[PDB]
Subunit: 263 residues, 4 copies
C-alpha cells in the first residue's frame, strides 16, 4: 500500500511550496540571499499595488453616488483588485521572499521571530519603494487625477478609521501567521487565504478610510499626489497596532501549544 | 518510487490540517483545552462577525431601491462579508477550535457526537458573547444607525422566513459534516467549502430575513440595537431545525456506510 | 526521507476524496447501493436547485433594465447561485453519488462508461424529481410570481439558444470528464472546477435562454409554473448535444492516450 | 507511520496533475504528440474565448454609463468571463497541452525553454485559429453588432494602452512561469492562479484597452468585425513585451537559484 511516485514526478512532492522565510536559516545573510528576498518583495509588491491602483483608478470613474452613499459594485471591484492582486503577488513570490508585500505583515513576522529584524527592515524599505514606484507607474499610465490615494470617507472619524485599519490589518496578519508561518498541510494554500483576508479587509475599510492596511500602499500614492492628509498617521499606526494584535493572539496560542491535545 | 521528503519539509506532511474536534479525545477536558477551544471560537467568531457587520453596515448605505426591489450588488457584497468572513475565520481557527463560529454548527456536531455536549455549550456561549462584542464594536466603529440587525423583508412572512433560515442553515451544517467531520483527502479544504455554503445561504436569505443562519449573528445586533423583533425566534428555531435536518441526512448516510461499495 | 503519518491522521491520506462512481464496481447493484446513489443525487440536486431558484427569484426583483438591456450585477448574482450552489452540492455528495446533479452530466458519464445505463437512468429520474421538489419548495417559500423558470430573452432566437445551451453544457460536461472521471492528483478538486464551469455557463446563457444547462433545472419550474414554452425542447436537446460533444472530445483524447508522451 | 494507499486509489497519487509541457521530452515530435498538443490548445482556446466573447457581448448590453464613466459591475462580469473562462479551459487542457491558450504565454514558455520553438509556433497558430473560430461562433450565436472586439477607451492613449497591456500580460506570464513551469507542491493548482491573474489583468485593462492580453483574443474579433484599428499593434507588441518582461524576471530568479538558501 505504498505511494508510487514516478521519478519525473518527484519534484512535485519533494519541492515543498512553502514561504521562503521558512527556510531562512544558516546561510541567509549573504548578499545573494538578501537580494533574492528584496527582489521578491519588490516584484510582488509592485505588481500587486500597481494592479490594484489602476483598478481603483478605474472603479473611481463610476458616476458619483448621491448623498455620500456607498456603491457596492465599486467597492467589490476595488476589493478584488487588492485581494486578488495580493493573492497573485503572494503566489508568485512565495518561494522567493515569502510574499509579505506589506510592512505590517513583515512586522508581525519579525515579532513572531519568523523573519529577523535586519532582513525585515530591508523588506519593509523595499515594499515602500515598490509602492512609490507602483503609484508613479499607475499615475503615469492613467488619465485624469489620481483617484487611488487613501482618504477618510463615509462619515468616519479619524478614531473610527484608526480602529477599522487596526482590526482589518490584524485579520490579514493573523491569517499569515496561522496559515503561512505555522507549518501544516495547508501552508501551501496560505496565499489564497491571505488574498481573501485582504479582500474582506477592503470591504470593511474602503468606504471609511480608503483601506490602507499596508503603509507601503498608503505612502506611495501620497508621494505621487504630493499630498499627505494630516491624519496620514492612521495608515501607519493602525496597521502597526493590527500587527501587534495578531502577533499577540498567535503568541498566546503558541504558549498554549494550541494544536496538541496533550503536549 | 518512494516519496522523498526533506526533513525540514516533514512538518507540512506530518502536521495534518484538521479541525481541532477531530483530535479531542482523552485529555480534552482540562481547563487548558477548554480555554483553547473557547479562545478559538471567540477570536474566530469575533473577527468573522465584526467584519461582516461592518461590511453590511456599508452595503446598507447604498441608495434605496424603489418599490422594495432587490439590489444584487448590495446582496453580493453582504454575502461576501459573511461568506468570505467565515472562510477566513475558519481557516484561522481550524486547528484551535475547529472554527464552528455558529451555535447551530456546534449543535449539529454535538448531535453527530463530534463534540461533547458540555464543550459544545461552552463553545455556543462563547460564540454568543463574541457576537455581542462584534455587534458592539461594529456599532462603535461606524456612524449612523445600526444597519446590520436581522429583519424580515422582501415581502416574506415569518413562516417563509423560518423555512428559508432552516434550509439555508442545513446547507451550511451538512457542508461542515461532510467536509470537516468526515475524514478524507478534502477535510483540509473544508473551510473553503463552508465559506461558499454560507455565501450561498446569504444570497438565499438576506433579502427575505436578513440572513441569520447563526443565533450568535442574530442575537448580538439585537442587543446592540436594544430591540428584538417579535419574530426573533425564527433566528433560533430556523437554524436549530437546519442543524437537525443536516444531522439527519448525515446520520442516514453513516448508517448506510455511504462511502463504501461493499461494507 | 519517508513521509511520516501519525495513525490518527491516516484517514486523511487513506480515504480518497473521489467521486462515488469511481468505485462502483462489483457489488454496486444492490438495493442499498442504488439507494445511496439516489439519495446523493436527490439531496444534492434539491439543495443546489432550491438554493439557486430562490437566489434567482430574488435577483429577478431588481428594477427592470430599460430597452431589454442587461444587468451585470443581476446576472452575476444568478450565476453565483447556480455555480456556487452546484459547487456546494457536489462537494457534499461527491462520495455519496458523485454529485452529477444534472441529467446531461449523467448522460455524458454513461457515454463514457463511468456510470452504467440503468444506474444512470435512476440518477436522472431522481434529479428530475428533485428539481420538481426544489421548484415547488422555492415557489412556496417566496412571494409573488415564479421568476426562476427558463425563457428566451435578450433578442435570442430558439436556434441561437439551442447552440448556447449545447456549448455551455459541453463546457460543464467536459470539466466533469477531465477533472472528476479522469484519475489524477486534481480529481479531489473537481467539484470546485465544476462549479466555476457552471458559473461561466450561466454568464453565457442567462440573458439569452435563462440558462437551462440541465433538464432537471428547466423541467421543475415549468411544472411549478404550469406552463411549458413551445421551445422547451431546447432545454433538453441543447444539453444532450452538449453532453455528446463533451464525450466526443474526451473520447478522442482517450483514444490518443493524451496524458502520456510515449504510450 | 507510512502512508497507506489502497490500490484502487493509487491513480490519484501516481498520476500527477502537471502541465503537458513538463513531460515533453524524447518522443514528443511525433505527429500524434503534435496533434494532441494542438487539439488541447484548440479546444481550450475555443471554449475559453467563445465563452468570454459571449459574456462580453452580454455585459456590453448594459445601459450606457454617462460621461465616459466606468461600470464596475460590467467590468467585473467581463473579467469573470475571461478569468474564470481561462481557468476552466486550463484545468480541462492542462494534461493535454498545458493550457497556454494565448500566444504570449507560449512565447514566454519558449523563451524559458519549457516548450521548443516549432511546437510553440504550432500552438500559437492553433490559438489564433481557435480565436477566429470563437469570434465567428460568438458573433453567429448573438444578436446585434459585435461588442467583444478590443478598442481603446476611458481616455487612454495608445502609449498608455501599450504599457497597460504589457504589464498585465507580464503578470499573467509570470504566474504561469512561477506556478506551472516551476515544479513544486502547488504546480497542480496553477490553473486557478492563472485564472485569477487574468481576472486581475482584465480589471486593469478592459476600461482602457478592452483587455487584449492575448493576440489570439484580439485578432479573432477584428477579423469577424472586418475591421482593425490602426492601433491594433498594441495588442501584439504589448503582450510580447509582457512575455519578455516575465521571462526576464523568472530568468533572474533561476540564475539566482531563488528557491534554495545554500545552493
Ligand atoms: C558548521 C555549523 C553549521 C553548518 C551549516 C548549516 C547550514 C544549514 O542551512 C539550512 O539547511 C536547511 C536544511 O537542513 C535548509 O532548509 C535551510 O534553508 C538552510 O538555511
Ligand atoms: C512604468 C512606465 C509607464 C510609462 C507610461 C507612460 C505613458 C505616458 O502617456 C502619455 O502621458 C501624457 C501625459 O503625461 C499624455 O499626454 C499622453 O497622451 C500619454 O500617452
Ligand atoms: C499522575 C498524577 C498526575 C496528575 C495530573 C492529572 C493531569 C490531567 O490533565 C492532563 O495533563 C496532561 C499533562 O500532565 C496534559 O497533557 C493533558 O492535556 C491534560 O488533560
Ligand atoms: C490509561 C488509558 C489511556 C491513556 C491516555 C491516552 C491519551 C490519548 O490522547 C489522544 O491521543 C491521540 C493520539 O493517539 C491524539 O490524536 C488525541 O489528540 C489525544 O486526545
Ligand atoms: C472595539 C473598540 C472600538 C472603539 C471604537 C471607538 C470609536 C469612537 O468613535 C467616536 O464615536 C463618537 C460617537 O460615539 C463620535 O462622536 C466620534 O466622532 C467617533 O470618533
Ligand atoms: C453466499 C450467499 C450470500 C448471498 C447474498 C448475496 C448478497 C449480494 O449483495 C452484496 O452483499 C454484500 C454483503 O453480503 C455487500 O457488501 C455488497 O455491497 C452487496 O452487493
Ligand atoms: C468472485 C469474483 C469477485 C469477488 C468480488 C469482488 C468485489 C470487488 O469490489 C470492488 O472492490 C474494490 C477494491 O478492490 C472497490 O474499490 C470497489 O468499490 C468494489 O466495487
Ligand atoms: C418545503 C416546505 C416549504 C414550506 C413553505 C411554506 C410557506 C408558506 O407560506 C405562506 O404562504 C402563503 C401563500 O401560500 C402566504 O399567504 C403566507 O403568508 C406564507 O406564510
Ligand atoms: C525500431 C524501428 C521502429 C521505428 C519507429 C520510430 C517511431 C518513433 O515515434 C515514437 O513511437 C513510439 C511508439 O513506437 C511512441 O511511443 C513515441 O511517442 C513516438 O515518438
Ligand atoms: C535511446 C535513448 C533514449 C531512449 C528513449 C527515452 C524516452 C524518454 O521519454 C520520456 O520519458 C519520461 C519518463 O522517464 C517521460 O516523463 C517523458 O514524457 C518522455 O518524453
Ligand atoms: C458554431 C455554430 C453556431 C451556429 C449558430 C447559428 C445561429 C444562427 O441564428 C440565426 O441567425 C440569423 C442571422 O444570421 C437570425 O436571423 C436567426 O433568427 C438566428 O436564429
Ligand atoms: C571556507 C572558506 C570559504 C568562505 C566563504 C564563506 C561564504 C559564506 O556564504 C555562503 O556561501 C555558500 C557558498 O559557499 C552559500 O551556499 C551560502 O548561501 C552563503 O551564505
Ligand atoms: Cl477622531
Ligand atoms: Cl491539495
Ligand atoms: Cl490628524
Ligand atoms: Cl407567518
Ligand atoms: Cl412573531
Ligand atoms: Cl430559430
Ligand atoms: Cl418551438
Ligand atoms: Cl500615444
Ligand atoms: Cl496607431
Amino acid at each position: 500500500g505504498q505511494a508510487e511516485i514516478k521519478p519525473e514526478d518527484a519534484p512535485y512532492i519533494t519541492n515543498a511550496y512553502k514561504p521562503a522565510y521558512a527556510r531562512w536559516g544558516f546561510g541567509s545573510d549573504s548578499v545573494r540571499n538578501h537580494f533574492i528576498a528584496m527582489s521578491g518583495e519588490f516584484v510582488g509588491t509592485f505588481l500587486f499595488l500597481w494592479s490594484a491602483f489602476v483598478i481603483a483608478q478605474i472603479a473611481n470613474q463610476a458616476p458619483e453616488t448621491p448623498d455620500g452613499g456607498s456603491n457596492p459594485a465599486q467597492l467589490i471591484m476595488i476589493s478584488f483588485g487588492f485581494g486578488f492582486g495580493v493573492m497573485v503577488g503572494v503566489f508568485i513570490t512565495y518561494r522567493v521572499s515569502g510574499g509579505n508585500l506589506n510592512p505590517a505583515v513583515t512586522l508581525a513576522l519579525v515579532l513572531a521571530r519568523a523573519i529577523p529584524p535586519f532582513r525585515g527592515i530591508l523588506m519593509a524599505f523595499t515594499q515602500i519603494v515598490a509602492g512609490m514606484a507602483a503609484a508613479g507607474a499607475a499615475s503615469a499610465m492613467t488619465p485624469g487625477e489620481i483617484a487611488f490615494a487613501n482618504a477618510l470617507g463615509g462619515g468616519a472619524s479619524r478614531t473610527r478609521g484608526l480602529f477599522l485599519e487596526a482590526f482589518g490589518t490584524a485579520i490579514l496578519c493573523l491569517t499569515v501567521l496561522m496559515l503561512a508561518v505555522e507549518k501544516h498541510r495547508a501552508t501551501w494554500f496560505a496565499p489564497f487565504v491571505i488574498g481573501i483576508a485582504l479582500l474582506i479587509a477592503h470591504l470593511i475599510c474602503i468606504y471609511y478610510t480608503g483601506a490602507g492596511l499596508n503603509p507601503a500602499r498608503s505612502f506611495g500614492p501620497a508621494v505621487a499626489a504630493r499630498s499627505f492628509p494630516n491624519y496620514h498617521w492612521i495608515y501607519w499606526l493602525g496597521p502597526i497596532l493590527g500587527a501587534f494584535l495578531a502577533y499577540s493572539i498567535w503568541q498566546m496560542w503558541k504558549w498554549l501549544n494550541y494544536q496538541t491535545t496533550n503536549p
